[PDB]
């Protein structure tokens, strides 16, 4: 591999969180189900996406932040774990024994989970990255609404940020 | 330009927040809509407004503070970003990839956003300021009321303050 | 004037808050109305009242503390400002551009506002104090109850305390 | 009272003289008469006037400068004294035994008289200032024109400036 | 912008005053009228004019000197202020509250007024300078001739000099 090419962190991007995706959390979800399966790719942050268009190859982790738009009178948690590569993702993947964080439905402050680059190589090529970690937001205790009515489908907004070790390795035609 | 003319910060004004405007947040708002579009002008703080009557020309940023008058059983967030000048403001302006802050509906403490003076020049003339930043309070996750009733139109009060770099440059007839 | 005569602060009184008055906050209040207009007098703390019976003349500020007995599912704020003497108090007194504090309806911790002695003289005589500041608790965003029912008239309890600069000047017949 | 709120003198205003009033000096004036009776108020300098609109209460003196638009072939002087408050102003007020300055009719350079804040209190309220000094420009030796003709009514222009101790004490609605 | 290109002041030009314009002062002028409205341009000093032919772009102020050719038996003053750009120049422009200097009709020594470069940019282009200050010589107390006769139209000669901060930025075809 080559030298790092996104050094000098203080550059707005990689120091601030930007929107990645939004997923809905339902009351009728079974408490072991899987929502928001995402893969370690540079197509999560848009500035990271356009510099991955610029560069050939990337390395380093990505910092994920979850903001829940739910009322204070809600219950149930979400479990977020960084699944190792090589482990099959699907039904029966029990998430709660991985190193995980707990995200409340009535959480005022956003919960941040660091997703490192668990890779056998130095870098992931842009055309074919190879073995990459997977971030899984499995439910930990289902949503409970003690009211009854139309409000049963609150949603969580995922915010993303490159970490301190994220950097591109080789430049190419943008 | 000339020297700064509102040095020695500790002067009550510019160290305390004062009311600027109030806007309403509705349940039926689409979650990408725009509320409270404001422009970087000295006609936001009243003491700043009367010294802009006193002086000719101004420079430096302004500190914005938002206080949400909503119940603890509300959901949904607000996104506040400082839009650069030169960028058109309207429908389709996607705010969530700008450097932004997240304001909860059930936030106990007020959320403060610093709006810097992004200017090509040294100062903005009072008659014609030129290129100025724009503060946009776009919605991030719509309001959800799990009750049903007359309460669907809570409102947010904007408080304003000159920053540490705000200062007037030239004096004129007040 | 004479020397200070309530030095050595650590004396229980002036270091602890004691009850002064209680006022009600209604849902149907207009959001610019005025509740709890109080005047800078020693007849706010009872120990201060009986030493004002003891002494002739007083100086120094008073520390005001507000405890709101409201539910966590309430909205709306209260604005507390120390109005300067010489300024007329009534309808149309816009409070939000004075140096103020914001008190939530669902505030867990009491909000404390320091009310200084803004006086032209050294001391205020007990018989006629002269120009004194006025503490005004104007509403900032009206009360919103998303339930509907009998609960619309929550109340706030004012607690008072002499400040660090409060002291009596001359002794007389108690 | 409160802290000073117009510290850091070097601010153009209070370091430069600005026009206040103009009064005429006639040949036929009796040599003990009184022209230009002014009172110690912030409505003498316009920047001081608009910050007195901004603030509530003021303290400190004001620096007065007189520029006489008279020929070099004129005679007679003007006497400028700062009359203490409590002293009645009218006919019979003999000015020449107060601490005074002498202003010539043919004076090339402007004559500056410092008018201090002779006050019993800490500050003067904006609505009612109380006891204030009075600047009286009494004549010392009447105008003599050795020519004879239409030129007998030369005029003096008063210029004003806040002094080093002038400062506002409390802020209010501008 | 580029580096300064008229450094090393001691070069005769910019250290000595040279003639710019001459204007007449009449007895029948109203005492608020405007004479000699000039604009901040390099076409005021002739050496500055030919190096502005040499160079492309300029910055820095200009030092203005006024020599009045009037008798010692004349009265009335002239007021010279540097009007900020953005302020409209015409009838009703009250000059006496700008930072100004007072020029006597019988002044032996010339009165010098420094006219700084109040600009939003780094430099003024030669083809289009943009926002520039304006020097206005408004009358302060009208001319009075106590004689009566043909002498009522004395004139003032303006002398100009580049200041210490005046310098050109970019060279072009002279």
Swiss-Prot record, chains A, B, C, D, E:
Q: Where in the cell is it found?
A: Virion; Host cytoplasm
Name the domain of life: Viruses
What is the role of this chain? Capsid protein VP60 self assembles to form an icosahedral capsid with a T=3 symmetry, about 35 nm in diameter, and consisting of 180 capsid proteins. A smaller form of capsid with a diameter of 23 nm might be capsid proteins assembled as icosahedron with T=1 symmetry. The capsid encapsulate VP2 proteins and genomic or subgenomic RNA. Attaches virion to target cells by binding histo-blood group antigens, inducing endocytosis of the viral particle. Acidification of the endosome induces conformational change of capsid protein thereby injecting virus genomic RNA into host cytoplasm.
How is the subunit organization of this protein annotated in UniProt? Homomultimer. Interacts with host type II histo-blood group structures antigens at the surface of target cells.
Q: What is this protein called?
A: Capsid protein VP60
Q: What organism is the protein native to?
A: Rabbit hemorrhagic disease virus (strain AST89) (Ra/LV/RHDV/AST89/1989/SP)
Q: Give the residues of the full protein shown.
A: 1821 to 1994 of 2344
């Amino acid at each position: 591999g080559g030298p790092p090419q996104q050094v000098d962190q203080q550059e707005t991007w990689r120091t601030n969180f930007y929107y990645n995706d939004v997923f809905t959390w339902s009351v009728a979800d079974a408490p072991g189900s899987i929502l928001y399966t995402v893969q370690h790719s540079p197509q999560n942050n848009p500035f990271t996406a356009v510099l991955s268009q610029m560069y050939a190859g990337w390395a380093g982790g990505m910092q994920f932040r979850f903001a829940v738009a739910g009322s204070g009178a809600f219950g149930g948690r979400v479990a977020a774990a960084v699944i190792p590569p090589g482990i099959e993702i699907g039904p029966g993947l029990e998430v709660r024994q991985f190193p995980h964080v707990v995200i409340d439905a009535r959480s005022l402050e956003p919960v941040t989970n660091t997703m490192p680059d668990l890779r056998p190589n130095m870098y992931h090529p842009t055309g074919d990255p190879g073995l990459v970690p997977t971030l899984v937001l499995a439910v930990y205790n289902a949503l409970i609404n003690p009211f009854g009515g139309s409000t049963s489908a609150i949603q969580v907004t995922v915010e993303t940020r490159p970490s301190e070790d994220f950097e591109f390795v080789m430049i190419r035609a943008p």
